Amino acid sequence: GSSST
Amino acid sequence: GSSST
Amino acid sequence: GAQVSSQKVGAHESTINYTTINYYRDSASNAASKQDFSQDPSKFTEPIKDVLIKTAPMLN
Amino acid sequence: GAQVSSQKVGAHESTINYTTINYYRDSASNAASKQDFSQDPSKFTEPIKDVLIKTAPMLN
Amino acid sequence: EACGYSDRVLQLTLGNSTITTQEAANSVVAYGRWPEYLRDSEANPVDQPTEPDVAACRFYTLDTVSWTKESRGWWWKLPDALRDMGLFGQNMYYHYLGRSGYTVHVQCNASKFHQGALGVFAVPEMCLAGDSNTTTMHTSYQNANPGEKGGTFTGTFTPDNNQTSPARRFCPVDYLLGNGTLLGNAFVFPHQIINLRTNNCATLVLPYVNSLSIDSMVKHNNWGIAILPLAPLNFASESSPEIPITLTIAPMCCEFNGLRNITLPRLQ
Amino acid sequence: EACGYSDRVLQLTLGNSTITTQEAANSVVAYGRWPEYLRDSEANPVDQPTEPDVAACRFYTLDTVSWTKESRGWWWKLPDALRDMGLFGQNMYYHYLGRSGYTVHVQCNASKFHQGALGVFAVPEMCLAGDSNTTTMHTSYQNANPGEKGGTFTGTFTPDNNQTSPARRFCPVDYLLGNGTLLGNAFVFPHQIINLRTNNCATLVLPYVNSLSIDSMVKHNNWGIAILPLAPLNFASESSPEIPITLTIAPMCCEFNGLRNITLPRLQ
Amino acid sequence: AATSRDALPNTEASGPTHSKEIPALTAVETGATNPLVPSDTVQTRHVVQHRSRSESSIESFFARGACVTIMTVDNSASTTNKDKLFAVWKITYKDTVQLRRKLEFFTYSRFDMELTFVVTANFTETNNGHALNQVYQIMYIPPGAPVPEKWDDYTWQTSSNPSIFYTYGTAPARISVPYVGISNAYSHFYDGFSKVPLKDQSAALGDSLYGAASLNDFGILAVRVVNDHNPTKVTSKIRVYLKPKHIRVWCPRPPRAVAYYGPGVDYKDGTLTPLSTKDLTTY
Numbered sequence A, B: 001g002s003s004s005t
Numbered sequence C, D: 001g002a003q004v005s006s007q008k009v010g011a012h013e014s015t016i017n018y019t020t021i022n023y024y025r026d027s028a029s030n031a032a033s034k035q036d037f038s039q040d041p042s043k044f045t046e047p048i049k050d051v052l053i054k055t056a057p058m059l060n
Numbered sequence E, F: 001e002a003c004g005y006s007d008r009v010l011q012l013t014l015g016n017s018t019i020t021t022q023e024a025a026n027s028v029v030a031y032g033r034w035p036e037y038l039r040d041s042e043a044n045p046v047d048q049p050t051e052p053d054v055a056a057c058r059f060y061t062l063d064t065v066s067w068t069k070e071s072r073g074w075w076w077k078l079p080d081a082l083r084d085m086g087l088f089g090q091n092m093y094y095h096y097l098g099r100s101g102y103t104v105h106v107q108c109n110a111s112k113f114h115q116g117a118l119g120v121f122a123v124p125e126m127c128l129a130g131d132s133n134t135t136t137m138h139t140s141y142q143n144a145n146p147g148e149k150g151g152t153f154t155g156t157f158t159p160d161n162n163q164t165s166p167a168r169r170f171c172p173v174d175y176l177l178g179n180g181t182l183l184g185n186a187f188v189f190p191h192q193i194i195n196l197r198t199n200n201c202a203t204l205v206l207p208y209v210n211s212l213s214i215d216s217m218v219k220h221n222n223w224g225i226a227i228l229p230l231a232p233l234n235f236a237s238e239s240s241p242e243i244p245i246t247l248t249i250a251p252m253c254c255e256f257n258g259l260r261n262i263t264l265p266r267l268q
Numbered sequence G: 001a002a003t004s005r006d007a008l009p010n011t012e013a014s015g016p017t018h019s020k021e022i023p024a025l026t027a028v029e030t031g032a033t034n035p036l037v038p039s040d041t042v043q044t045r046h047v048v049q050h051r052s053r054s055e056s057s058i059e060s061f062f063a064r065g066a067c068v069t070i071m072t073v074d075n076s077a078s079t080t081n082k083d084k085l086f087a088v089w090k091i092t093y094k095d096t097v098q099l100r101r102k103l104e105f106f107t108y109s110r111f112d113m114e115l116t117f118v119v120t121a122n123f124t125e126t127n128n129g130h131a132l133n134q135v136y137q138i139m140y141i142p143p144g145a146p147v148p149e150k151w152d153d154y155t156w157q158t159s160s161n162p163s164i165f166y167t168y169g170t171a172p173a174r175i176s177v178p179y180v181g182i183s184n185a186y187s188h189f190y191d192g193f194s195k196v197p198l199k200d201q202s203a204a205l206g207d208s209l210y211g212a213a214s215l216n217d218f219g220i221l222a223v224r225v226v227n228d229h230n231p232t233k234v235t236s237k238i239r240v241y242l243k244p245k246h247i248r249v250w251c252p253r254p255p256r257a258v259a260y261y262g263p264g265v266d267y268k269d270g271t272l273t274p275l276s277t278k279d280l281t282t283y
């Protein structure tokens, strides 16, 4: 879905 | 939606 | 319908991924996944009826 | 498979973000993240066997 | 230490050999990496390695050279300088592959009335420039590899003009570090300085460095040792002072792969 | 074994070397003792030993000799026969002390129509008799130590009569085992027989045997290999048959003490 | 965990001093650089440091495309003493100087290669006769694959070699290449030879170039105009731009101080004086 760094 | 391999 | 898979990362700068969406109804239109399998060579390298034990005499 | 990271905002008009999606299987095709690390210079600036204390005599 | 221990006084022991010094300026470990054997996760040739341990990882002393007012500098290559050193050299020429780290100990004492300073540099891949301006990359194997005598630097580039029978040797100009870069910057390489008022030796511990885990020691040199007078020798008012410089070097954690008959190189 | 395993078919692997055989008569381990490194409780020189492991503990093949109707026998000494064999020989001459065990594999094939039998004996301290009847114990170092060529037995004692310049060599008479004892009793030493109808090789695994834990390999030989025709070579009705005999020997568990400069012996 | 864009350390305020602590005295013989900061030798104020080293990270230092070669091709009628011109180039960063100098601050490197191709064409002769839009084929020929001898021979089929068919006047072409070295890193310097000269061998037979390792390190690019020829002549140039992405570097070196003179570290007489006159006591 989504990775958030 | 999404498949993840 | 998005497909998310991991890249095998070679030179480096967690798992890096990439996304794929099929745009067409016909599977023939799809790109190649390159997610392929391997198999043992045996059907070509050991096609003999009686299993070979390599430490044993091949002829007995 | 979207990757969301923050920008270091320089001139201004909360955290502003940007999105990245990898389109290819090979990590070599990817853009550079620029999310890089720093390290201490020591292996080049203090390569000595006995740790240097700067207030102390370097030779003792 | 209150029990006498000093940065200036060291003892090094490898195999059946010991070095003592009473005037060191600490010692250097190149890039902070101590020598190691090749790890399984980085291994490449699959045959059982040969590890000669104390038979080869011991201090070998090379031929002593002489430092004078006219000295421009000296150079050596590793493993080349050790190719004829006891069982290290034997193990080297019997195998296709070899890797090794080193303790390099440069020795030069004088007196409180002498002055001068040697920059001692260990350079990974110390490629040196040739003598020709009609051809590039043409220094012969024989001239590239002096063995223990090493070579020297010069203050002047002087091109080989015999085109019939070219010298095929290096022409390493000192302020260009023999490679077209400025000597004042050689301090980014692991180094020590023998400044005669301060210390009488330099000690460099070198890891095996290469773009491979193991390689041909006979085809390829991993490290270069360059010694240059940063401040010239001087003593009292003598016009012609001289003091000796001695190199003692020990292989460390060396291992060899690909055993066969011994290599007999064309060295002259 | 019901999966084919046989007493006659063996594979031996030491270092980068493998021997196969399809006609063995089992193999022998001398005095039931397999080779071992020197244990701390039996140790004597205190310096760190050199243990070359695969670099020296591998199969070396000596020069092939020829068996004929007139052959009286051949002999070799260990470690002498291996003194010029790769890194084993190097390690041997660089150190004062050395100890080693061995796998000895004697090779000799023929055909179902040939006949003959070689007794292959490994003798601890195989002292051989000299050629003189005016002097005793006078065989020179050079003649005592043939290196890989070995020596031979004779059916006749023939005394050296040149007193001006004595031959100073052995005169080893076959039925006296070259040492004044009867050959028929040599079977109390560890042995095998190559009887051509039965087998085409002999394999002897020898421990280091000595009255010391370690000794001078250059001054002293621990084992002697004696090969004698117990039943002579014969084939069809040929007057002059010949078949080759090859020795391949591997050092096992060898270690060396007392490293210095290399020994350069007077061998001629 | 410290990142390239993190701010550098704050200056801490510091006052007068009178002690046995001697930061200022040191000994460069040891091989170390004295790690001093202004508060070690002067009085300082507190400053909150905002500056970062973001633009000098190895990646940011190299994150630019650099021209490494110019290839010339034409689209002319092949005639008995001269054929239609196709170009062949041995891949390297050493034909130009700027990227070479930057890479050579280091001994070894690893990176993914981004190649961008800028293509330009022109008429060479006066006739008012025209040409139609050209398509170019850029074929990568890895060491071992057959090199083209003619603009139209069988090798341009490319069943296995990667090729780019570039259309004139469209966006500059671009492909990526993984780290393809046969070693664990690319060697910017190789102090050695590819052959050992043996004594039992002739000198000629044991000879090789100093500092060269694999003869054809990376192979060739072969470029051609795919179009048949026009009555009028058109010449084209393919400018190749190399950017090292995802890069790592080891063992720093002093930069090239005198002009490059070939693929090795050699230098030419007459080029060895980089420094200019300046008096010791003149600002």
Ligand SMILES: CCCCCCCCCCCCC/C=C\[C@H](O)[C@H](N)CO
Pocket: G091, G092, G093, G113, G115, G138, G139, G140, G162, G163, G164, G175, G177, G180, G181, G186, G187, G188, G217, G218
């Ligand atoms: C259709 C276009 C395909 C282009 C394919 C190019 C593949 C070859 C990549 C070459 C890698 C060159 C790396 C640079 C040089 C080396 O670092 C040094 N000279 C030492 O190894």
Ligand SMILES: *C(=O)CCCCCCCCCCCCC
Pocket: B001, B002, C001, C002, C021, C022, C023, C024
């Ligand atoms: C599964 O695909 C659900 C998510 C949809 C994500 C956005 C799709 C991007 C545009 C695809 C257009 C359709 C192509 C025929």
Ligand SMILES: *C(=O)CCCCCCCCCCCCC
Pocket: A001, A002, B002, C002, C004, C019, C020, C021, D001, D002, D021, D022, D023, D024
């Ligand atoms: C993770 O990526 C799940 C969300 C998908 C978001 C839309 C993707 C946008 C189009 C990408 C096409 C695929 C590229 C090969």
